[PDB]
Each structure stands twice: as structure tokens, then as C-alpha cells.
Amino acid sequence: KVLTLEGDLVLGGLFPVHQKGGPAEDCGPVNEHRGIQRLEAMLFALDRINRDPHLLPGVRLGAHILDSCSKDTHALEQALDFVRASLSRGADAPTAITGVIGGSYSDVSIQVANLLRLFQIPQISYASTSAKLSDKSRYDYFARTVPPDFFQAKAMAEILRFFNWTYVSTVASEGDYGETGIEAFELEARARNICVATSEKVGRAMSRAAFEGVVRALLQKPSARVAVLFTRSEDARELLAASQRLNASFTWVASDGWGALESVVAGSEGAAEGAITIELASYPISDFASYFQSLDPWNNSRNPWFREFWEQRFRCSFRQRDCAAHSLRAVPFEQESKIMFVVNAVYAMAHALHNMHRALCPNTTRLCDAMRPVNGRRLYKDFVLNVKFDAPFRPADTHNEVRFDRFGDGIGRYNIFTYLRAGSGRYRYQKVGYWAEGLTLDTSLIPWASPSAGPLPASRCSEPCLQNEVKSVQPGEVCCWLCIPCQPYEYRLDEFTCADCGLGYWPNASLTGCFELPQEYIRWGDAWAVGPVTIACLGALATLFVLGVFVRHNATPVGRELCYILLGGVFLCYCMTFIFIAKPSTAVCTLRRLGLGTAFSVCYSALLTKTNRIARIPASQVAICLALISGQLLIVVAWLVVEAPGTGKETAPERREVVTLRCNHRDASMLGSLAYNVLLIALCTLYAFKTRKCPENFNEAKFIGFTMYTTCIIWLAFLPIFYVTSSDYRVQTTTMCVSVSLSGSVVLGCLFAPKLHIILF
Amino acid sequence: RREIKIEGDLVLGGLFPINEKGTGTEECGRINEDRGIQRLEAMLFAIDEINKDDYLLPGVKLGVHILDTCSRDTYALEQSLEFVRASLIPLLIAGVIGGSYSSVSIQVANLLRLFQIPQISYASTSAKLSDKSRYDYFARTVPPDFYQAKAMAEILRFFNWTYVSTVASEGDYGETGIEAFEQEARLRNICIATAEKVGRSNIRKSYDSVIRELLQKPNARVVVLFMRSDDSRELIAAASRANASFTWVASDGWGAQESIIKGSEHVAYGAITLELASQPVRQFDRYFQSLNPYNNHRNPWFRDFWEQKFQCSLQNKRNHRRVCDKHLAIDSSNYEQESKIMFVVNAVYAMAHALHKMQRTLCPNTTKLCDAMKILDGKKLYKDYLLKINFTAPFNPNKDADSIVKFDTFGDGMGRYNVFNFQNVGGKYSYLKVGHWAETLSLDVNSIHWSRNSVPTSQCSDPCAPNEMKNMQPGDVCCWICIPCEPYEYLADEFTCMDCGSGQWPTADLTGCYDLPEDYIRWEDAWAIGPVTIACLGFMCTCMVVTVFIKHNNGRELCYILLFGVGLSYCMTFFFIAKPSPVICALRRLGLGSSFAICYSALLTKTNCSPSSQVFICLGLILVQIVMVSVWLILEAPGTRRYTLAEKRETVILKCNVKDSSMLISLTYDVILVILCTVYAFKTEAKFIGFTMYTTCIIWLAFLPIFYVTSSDYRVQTTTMCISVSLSGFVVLGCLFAPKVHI
Ligand SMILES: N[C@](CC1c2ccccc2Oc2ccccc21)(C(=O)O)[C@H]1C[C@@H]1C(=O)O
Ligand SMILES: N[C@](CC1c2ccccc2Oc2ccccc21)(C(=O)O)[C@H]1C[C@@H]1C(=O)O
Ligand SMILES: *[C@@H]1O[C@H](CO)[C@@H](O)[C@H](O)[C@H]1NC(C)=O
Ligand SMILES: *[C@@H]1O[C@H](CO)[C@@H](O)[C@H](O)[C@H]1NC(C)=O
């Protein structure tokens, strides 16, 4: 059947008046909510356009509406009449189609657009939301009023980011809706920097056991308490039933498949408490309701399918009466949600035609000779796509602009619904905001978004950390990272790498390189070493006594330079200890190093001269001491030329010290001087094995022997002590200073013990 | 309104460009001689042969439904709309043998994919038809255009032409061809130098500019052409004026047409062109030649063709113009077979055979049109039987095995091309086929004439040699240049040269990072013969002086100890020199220390003069020196490091990797102190001992700095051994001249 009206400007149209044939037939029952209501909406829009002065005033608008029967092949056969009656014939009277407003199902729209692209016939759909009609390579002359299927995916991605949800689950379905939209949702989720679990899909013929298994699979991850539903009505209903059976707590962010529908929450109200759904935004037309209610078959002869619709709706046969006064009122009539889109499409086509007419014929408001061969390409590209007008049957003081983007799609406009309970034993859908270009959620009506008990925390898989580097992301899932704490030995040098530097274990939390604090780790020059330095001061007092010895030298009938040399050596070792303790530096370490060796050599030379003089029985003693001093000077010069500067040393990796040593160390050259002193002491003892007994200056000889024995014992005790303390430079200098001060004090005491008795006697 | 509706059991659609596109006030222009009447006559001849054949559809008779395209896409769509009014008097169409134009084929495929009608093209070579997402019911017996991109790009690989310059005409033919050829070249490691674009609206000024841009690039001597016939002809003519010589590698736009060269045969020579292979059909010539507009009443356009090929008016208005009689006929003098005729027949059979096979699957009980075959499922026929045909060419020449008609996964035909080389022979210019490309190269190099005895066009000068000459890229794209590296570091990688050893000196490219320690191991060379001879002489002298002793004695034991120490000093020279250095590096140092202690004891023996107690005390002092050198050894360790920092010139490695001036300085300082004490004691026989001790002291003082300032590769040990043996020899000379005075 065909539906032809007027003919001045014929408008095409395809509607699913009949449902798809069940028992292998062409067409079956009449689609009341999708084939009759939309058909009457288009007819009402055409009538309003005709009885309208500011749109197509002097030109009348016709119609050539057809039935597609929800079949792509049947739709192709019917749409063949659109091209065969306009331009196919030549270069049932044929009618010239100017535009086609039809196509509810995606496949029907695809086939009709494929047919009409070749013949340059523009088409404007009203219910085709398929995402594969957006590309103009395959569908050049296709436009639509409803938004595509990825706009709701973008809306849910923005919703997930708004609520700070990162690790979420995902449920999809088999077919175009469920697979095409899921890829777009994943793409925007990657663009939204959020995580997708990408769980299993639904084949629309899926058993209850398989649904339960998928529910358990979603329950495997406990941190992702959020699931995204790109499922149809039946799949969503089955999933809710399975969740209710298994008693699983979830919040579901759904799409237009769920919407604000109560048929999917029947018997599963407990499982859905914080369900978030998106419904395509639409408003009811009161004028269309008034037009449709006052419709009866007695005068409605324009619609060939009205009799069948009346027979299916009311039990009337028209052969036997069986019916009377069965007026269609508001009690059993409900306006279909996509009727404003049909009116918008018809009015957009009318406005495009009017604009083209005004541009081509600015003189008269009637068809010109240039309007008979209308060009579909120019009309679509310059006029159909460039439309900006207020939505009819809606006050102009509202952001309702029927416009097409660069791909000819509609303007995104959705409503967000939360399946909540107001407090009683009833459940209902409540709008909590809209999405035109950005979210407009209000945190006042959502039950789980209340400040109490938190806003349903469903954040990322892991948590940020400061002391633990983020370098243990799970292989294959970079969304669940492990806060591995790096060892304190390794500091922070990069963004996520804990690496040691050597000059400190943890300077600060700057996380940019390593900082070496300028300090000394062997800075013992304080009251802690107060005891040793004072002992050195005692040696200085002995030096003062040396001056008294000089006075004693003026009136002593009993050689005299040996005592002066011993006093000078004592002063030298005291000065070396003072230099070591007070301030260690590059120029303050070599001086004491040479001084201690010089003092040791002077003492050894004095002992050797004394024992040689004893065994023999001033020029010879002076020559011997000068030769010993020259040898010591050569030794210290060799030490200096071997390594003069001191650059310090680093500590062991087990700890973090400032400076292990003030100058160069770990050298066995001082062991050579120690061995030379030991050999000198051994030679002195070998000589004194028989030379110790000496009547001439017996007290002096005994004191010299005692001093030599004490020095040998002190050196033999200190050498292992020095070796042990070499591992700890903090106290090694103090131990060496104490040892040398004790040796000097012992030598001075041994020298002065018989002198006092001799003076007193 | 003219159309052919030959009835039959199965009706095959037809679609040919009978009428040229009207550029004036008429939709349809003239009558197309070659791509028009001749191709439809070939299809009719193939249909008649199929009907007369007793092996191909013996019972089913094939009908013909032939329309005209008028060389327009809209007209072709309007005509092909008659092919779909059979399932949605009308005639049921099994398939459509239509095409001859890329736009017409595209539009017809777009219309026919909706109604599931198989379509086979005989001349459409557009690459846009190769995708099944937009044309899932389209097949062709001719290869697509981009196949030629693979036909001659391998030629570039055959003659080692890695640097090419591409020139093409904008539109649809050369556009996709450029991308296909660039992809093939990139897959074959061939880089593109220039990429120009020729236009139909351009003039000689812009052509000369393309040539001028081509000339100012001497490396690229080969130009790959993707252009139409007129563009290539005019470009050759323009290059004639510029006196430009190139090696053109052109596509089917040039082919083997004599119109391309025109009067510019001296600039086109050596050109390589590709032509679609097409054997002539002997039976078609006889069928077409014996045709007159009196019995061929099934061809509505045949009268117009008769009035176009020959000036005739016998059909209508005889007196208006020059009427003709039956004297006008068709023969071989003024008729030539169109190149794409064997494809057209190959298309028709490609349907019939498929249908035949389909029957054998659906109607196997009789040789007739069974009812189950009346449905004529287009999808099943296309995806089950149309794409699975392996029949040979019906009219292939004798001994021609390569004549199987096949369709690949995209429905395209088999790519078979012929390579033509423009040559001069004798004094006549003509084309000559030099090979074929049936998915492989079969060029005949022995019969190819080049521009001037050779075609060198490689941009890269030469491959880089190994041994730090491979280098890397200098900042270009095609190949690279070669620069050397300093030979101390081996080129461990293909771009950089990095050191991997102390001395290294890599040997060849293979195993560059060899061990090659380059140690200072020196055998008994010329500089070593002296020290070993001196050591042997000293050993002989010590043996003589200990043999003369003991027997005649009337220091004693001290003298024997001194002689043993002198012998130890003499053998220390040989101990120091050793090519292999083991982990025991203390042998030389302990030997030197023992020699010094022996000298000190020998001096102290004369210093002292209870004497036996001193002879034991000096041994105890030697023991103290031994424990001191042991403590020294407790702080020094050997190794394999090299003490020379000359890198490439560092061909000597230290025997023991340890700081020489760390504690050896202290040991020598102790020795110097001891010997200075002995010298001071002796300064108070004895004179000779003091003199030789002084000579040794200044000798050591002079030889100490030179071992550190010169830092010889291997002579430091030799000089130390020479100094030691000289000191020992002086001591031995004194201790041997003393008995000379004694005797
Ligand atoms: N706009 C729809 C969307 C439709 C759809 C919507 C929700 C769930 C499943 C589902 O099936 C698919 C599959 C692919 C593309 C679109 C859909 C259309 O049919 O195109 C449909 C409302 C329009 C109407 O028929 O009135
Ligand atoms: N096979 C061709 C190839 C054709 C072509 C061949 C050579 C030079 C220019 C050129 O113009 C284009 C442009 C786009 C696509 C195809 C072509 C076809 O029409 O498809 C053409 C021989 C067939 C015929 O028309 O008889
Ligand atoms: C999401 O986190 C941001 C912090 O960047 C915060 O400002 C915002 O309030 C949070 N939104 C919630 C918790 O809904
Ligand atoms: C091309 O190079 C290969 C080796 O690189 C050589 O074998 C072949 O002969 C060359 N072909 C020529 C020079 O035509």
C-alpha cells in the first residue's frame, strides 16, 4: 500500500507500519507505537507546515509514504519507487521525490541510504542511531536527528571521570549495539585515562548458568565495584535476574538499552539500588496528542493502514459491527518517545527546501523554472546541513536547536536516571541531570552519593604512595600497581627509581639527585677528646721544665744536647697530637705526619748515641745525630713525593659518613719507620745486655735503659692497637695522640726521676 | 532505446560503451568502433559458441540482455536499473557482463550489490574496486592497476635501481599507482627522489619545469611514469626540446603505442614499458569480418556502425548523402582486433562455467533448468562457484599452458604483463618485447638496448668496508657515506666504534674484541743477553771464590754469609727477568730485600770490628727486614691491569698490577737509611769497601729517577736488574781483588 498526498513537492518516507513476518510471511501485525504513531506524527507535521505562513507560504508540500515492514529487502523494493518515479524514468502517475524522511531500524536506513546515494536523493532519518552511518564515504546524502550510539559512551566516560571512578568492569552484547558502541566506549575511556576490565559479552541466546558464570567472573575483581552495560533490554533483564539470584551487590552504569524502563527491574529491585542509566532526551507534543486522539476511521481515509490498526487495537471487524464509539482517548494512549524527532526531521527538510527556494527565487514566493530539476547534492550540502531553528511545538525560549554537525548527525542530549527508593517499599527512576555537552549532575538526590557513608568509593585499583616507588605495575594490567618500598640504602634520584648515590642514604625528599652535605665524619676536636689534649699540654709543661734544665745546665758539674733533643722531640710529638686533634686538613695532616717521624727519629738517634758512648768507654755525637736527621728527612721527602696531596676517602657502603679520612691513608710507609725504631730498640737492648752496668753515670745509664725498654714495650703494644684502630678513623687519631703523649711522658719521667734525687743529695 | 534482448533459458546481462559521451547538446555522441560494437560482438560470439558447445551447459541455453552505457555513470545506472526488475516482459538476469569504465563499473557494482547480482568486468582495472567492503559482488578478468606497481618495481630490483624519480598524472590512474609503487619500493628498500604531478590543464611551461626539476638531480637517472597516453607523449615531446636523456619506466599508459613517441624518438629510446598481455582470437576475426547489416538483425547499433566506419546512407536517406552498396565489406585491411577482446570472452565463460558447476551442485539429475535452480541465488553463485573457476582459456593459442582463468580472494584476475623496450634497429625504430611478468620476472637482458652502454643511477656510491670503515649515516636518507674510526677501538656495532680492551688492536671484523693482552713479556732478546751473561759470570765468580775457600782458610761464617748474599744478588738479576708473571709477585721484592740485608750485614761485620753475638744480631736485623717486607706484601696485591696509558701505543702491560711507588719507596728509604748508617760508620779492604759502597749509593741515586720519569714499556725491569748486577759486580770485583793482593 502507498500513501500519497498533494504532489506539488513530494516528500518521501518509509515507516515500519507492519512488523517482520513471523511464519515466513512478508508482513505481520501492525506496529502501533512505531509505525502508526510516527506516521501520524509525520502527517501532522506536514499539515502544520502547509497551514503555515512563514514556512513554504506559496508552495504546497506532499507525501509519498510507504511501509518497510521492518525488512531491508522490502525497504529496498519500496524505495525503488522513490528513484523510479523521479529521475530513473526517462532522462500510477510518477511523483518526484524531493527528500525522504524515513528509516527507523538501522539496517533499513543503511539499505535505503545505499540505494538513495546513487540517485542523489537526500534522506533524513528520525530513529537510526547506528554508529556506522556517520561516515560520509558510504552514505553521502544521509542525515539524522537522533544522536549516534557513541554519544552515550562519551557520556558514561565523562560520568566515570566525574565520580573519580577508574577501575571499572564492562558488560556488552552481541550485534551492532553492544559491539560497535563498546569499542567507542573503550576509546573514550583510554582518552579519559580510566581503566577497562573488558569482561565477557552476551550472545542474546545465553543460558542462565552462563549468565551466572559471567556474574561470578565480574565478582572475581573486588576492587572494581562498577560495571558498564552496553546491553539490550532482554540482556539487561537477564543480567539483573542473575545478579538477584546470586545476591551480588553492584552499581551499574547503563545505556539507552536500559534507560528508565521498569520492565527490566521486575523481581530484581534488590540487586539494583544505585543503578545509573541514560535515556535519550525527549519531550511530549501536546498538539500531536490532540491531533491523534481525535482520529477515527470514518473520516481518516488518508491512511490505508488505519483500518488494520483499529482492528488490532479494538476488537472490531468492519464486516460484523462488533464495535461502536470506540474513541481513542488519553487513557490507553501513550506518546512514543521518538515522535518529536520525526517532527524535527520533517521541519528540517521543510526549512531546507524553503531556504533553497528563497535563495534561488528571492522575487516571488512560488516555484520557478529553476526549481523543477532540484539537485539533491546542493540541497544536502548547502541547505539541509546548514539548519538552525527553534524546535516546533516548543517555546523558543529554550535551548532546542535542530542542527546537524559536519557528519550530519543530531545534537547529543541525554538524561541521567538513578534507580533509587525514596524511603518506602517502592522503587522509581529519578532524573539527576542532563548531558548536552557536559555533565550537570546534582549531588542532592542520588542515594549513594550522599556525604554519609562516602560517595560509593570505587576508585582506581591501587593507591598513590610517597616512600614507595611506583615501579611494580602488574604485567598486562598497568592499573594495579604495587607500592614496593625501596631500601633505605638507595636514595631517590628519579621519578620512580630508588638508586643509591654514595654520599648519604637519604638527604631529603627533593627526589632530584643526591645532595652531599659538607661536614667531617671524624670531627672529634671537641670536649670528647678533652682528656688527651690536656695530656699533650702536660708535655708542653715539660718543655718549660726543659728551660729550667737549661738553667740547670749552667751550674751542673755532672754531653748536654741529648736532653735538649729529647725535649724537642717531646714538643714535636705534642704539637703533632695538637695538630691532629684540633683541626684535620690537607695542609694540617702532612705537617704532623712529618713531625711524628722526626720526633721518633730524634729519640732513636739519642738512644743510639747514648748506647754507643756507653759501649765505647761532641763532634762524633753531632755528626751521628745530623746523619740520623738527614736520613729521616730523606724518608719523609720520599713519603711526600710519593703522595703529597690528600683528597680524603669514602666510607664503607654499609654506612654513610661524611669523610672517612682527612688525608691519604692506608699506607704502610709509617710501618717502615716503626720497624726502624723497633730495630734500633733491639740493638740498644742487645748492647745493654752487657753494657747496662756502667759505674760512670750509673743513674743516667739506668734511666736510658729504662726509657728504651719502656719505648719498646709501648711500641709493641701500640702496633696491634694502631692496626685495630686503623679500621675506625674516628678514634684512631685520638689513640695515636694518647700513645705518643704517654711515651713522651714516660721518657720525661724516667729521665727526671734520678735527677731530682741527685740534686737533693 | 536500443537494446539486445536475445531470449534464452538463462539471461546474462550486458553493458558496453557503444556510444561515446556527448560533449555538446546530445547525451550520446558517436559510435565507438573498438570498445563498443566490437566488444559486444565478441560477447555475442562467445555466447553463440557456448550455446553450440555440447560440453558447457548442453541443455541450458544462455540468453543475452545487452544495454549501452553512453560512456556515462548516470546513464549506466539508469540502464542497469533494468537488470534489477526481475526479482524485486521482464527478463531474469543471472549475471551482468559489464564494465569497460572504472566509474561505470563502480556505479553498477554499487547498485547491484544491494540486489545480489554478480558482475564480471572485462576492462575495469581500478584499484578502488578491489575492496569487498564496498563491492562484494564484483569480479574482473583483468588485473587491477596497482599490480603494475609490482610489475616494474621488481625490475628496479633486477637492475639494481635503488634511486628513482617518480612522475605521474593527477586523477585516478596515476594517483593510486604512486602510493602502490611507493609502498612496493619501500618494501624493496628503494627510496623515492622526486614526486611530481602532471595535469591535463597544464601547458608546456609547467612541463618544462618538471623536466628542469628532474635534470637538476644527476643521481636519479631513472623516471617511473604513471601517466595517460597524451600526457606521456607530450612529456616526451617536451623533453625532446630540453635535450634530456633518461631511462623511462612507464606503465600501460605508454605501452607499445606508436603515438607516444611521435617525432621525439631520440629521447624515448631505452624506455621500459608494461603492456597487458592479450593473445588474438582467430575465430573472432573470422566471425567479425563476415558481418553485414542484412543478416545481423540482432544488433540494433550495427547499422550505425556501418554508417560510421564507412560513409553510408543505404539504411535511410539514400539521396541525402553518398549512398553505398554491398561492395562495402569488412576485411583485414581496415579492421584490427581490440586488445581487450580475449578478456571479454574470458568474462562470459567465467559466468557460464560457474553456472554449469552450480547446476552440477543443485540440479545433478538432468541436463535441464531444474526448479531448484530457478531461484538463482547471487550470493551462493558468486562466493561458491564464480570465485572457484579454474578453466583454461577457450581460444588460447596452441602450446600456451599459461591460459588458466582464475579469480583471487578479491575477485581480480591474474596479473600477466609484457615488458617492451624501445630500441633502434638497422635504421627503423620499433618496440620489442624483452620479457614477461607472470607474477615473476622473465626479462631477456641479452636483447635490451640501454641509453649509453649502461644505466648507472644508484645514489649510494659504494658499500662501506669493514675494520672501522662501516661508519653510519651522514645526515641523508638513501644509503650513507663511509668515514673511518681510530683503530684503537673496535667497531662493536654497525654505527659506532667503542673500546673493549686495554690494548685491543682488533684483528679483522670477525672477533674484533679479542683478548690480545699485549703484555710486556720479553724473552732473551738482544737487550737481555747482556744481563744474563753478567749474572752467569757473577755466579761463576761466586762458585770459584767459595771453592777456593774452605780448602784453604788458615769473618769466617760471616764471610760465607756475605758470599751467599752476593750470589743471591747475582741471581736476582735473572729472577727479575721473567716473561710469565704469576700471582707470586713477592719473589723479586723479597730477593731485593734479602740482597740489601746481606749487603748491610757485610758492612756491619767490618763496622763491629761478642763478635759472634754481632754476627747473630745482623741476622736478626735481616729477619726484621724480612718481617717488614712481609707486612709490605700484606698490603700489595697483583693483577692484570696495564700501567701504560698510551691506549693504542700501550703495547706493554706491567708484570704486577700494583702501585709501584706506594711502599717500595718506603722499603728503599729504610734500605737507604741502613746503608747510610753503614757508610757513616765505615767513613771513620775497609777503604775499598767504603769506595764501592759509595759507588753503589750514587749509582742507585742516579738510577732511581729514570725508572719513574722515563716510564719505559719494558726497560724498567732491565735497568733495575742492570743496576743490581753492576753493584754486585763491583762488590765481587773488590772481594776478588783482595785475594789477588793476598796471593
Ligand atoms: N535507534 C535504534 C537503536 C537500536 C537499539 C537500541 C537499544 C538496544 C538495541 C538496539 O538495536 C540496535 C542495533 C544497532 C543499531 C541501533 C540499534 C535503531 O534501530 O537504529 C532503535 C531505537 C530505534 C527504533 O527502532 O525505534
Ligand atoms: N582499464 C581502464 C584503465 C584506465 C586507464 C588506463 C590507462 C591510462 C589511463 C587510464 O584512465 C583510468 C583512470 C582510472 C582507472 C582506470 C583507468 C579502466 O577504465 O578501468 C581502461 C582501459 C579500460 C577501458 O576504458 O577500456
Ligand atoms: C574527585 O577528585 C577531585 C580531586 O582531584 C575532587 O576535587 C572532587 O571533589 C572528587 N569528586 C568526587 C569525590 O565526587
Ligand atoms: C645487481 O647486483 C647483484 C648483487 O648485488 C648482482 O649479482 C647483479 O648482477 C646486479 N645486476 C645488474 C648489475 O644488472
Side-chain angles (χ1 to χ4, degrees), chain B residues 35 39 100-102 123-126 145 172-173 228 253 340:
Chain B
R35 309 173 177 177
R39 280 181 184 171
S100 189
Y101 274 111
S102 290
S124 312
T125 61
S126 193
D145 268 341
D172 189 26
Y173 177 48
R228 313 163 160 288
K340 291 197 180 180

Side-chain angles (χ1 to χ4, degrees), chain A residues 489 493 496-499 501-502 504 507 509-514:
Chain A
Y489 168 70
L493 310 184
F496 300 100
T497 81
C498 274
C501 178
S510 43
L511 316 179
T512 43
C514 57

Side-chain angles (χ1 to χ4, degrees), chain A residues 161-164 443 455:
Chain A
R161 178 48 74 200
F162 176 80
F163 276 118
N164 291 324
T443 317

Side-chain angles (χ1 to χ4, degrees), chain B residues 573 576 578 580-582 585-586 588-589:
Chain B
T573 290
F576 294 159
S581 305
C585 283
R588 306 179 193 176
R589 299 178 294 174

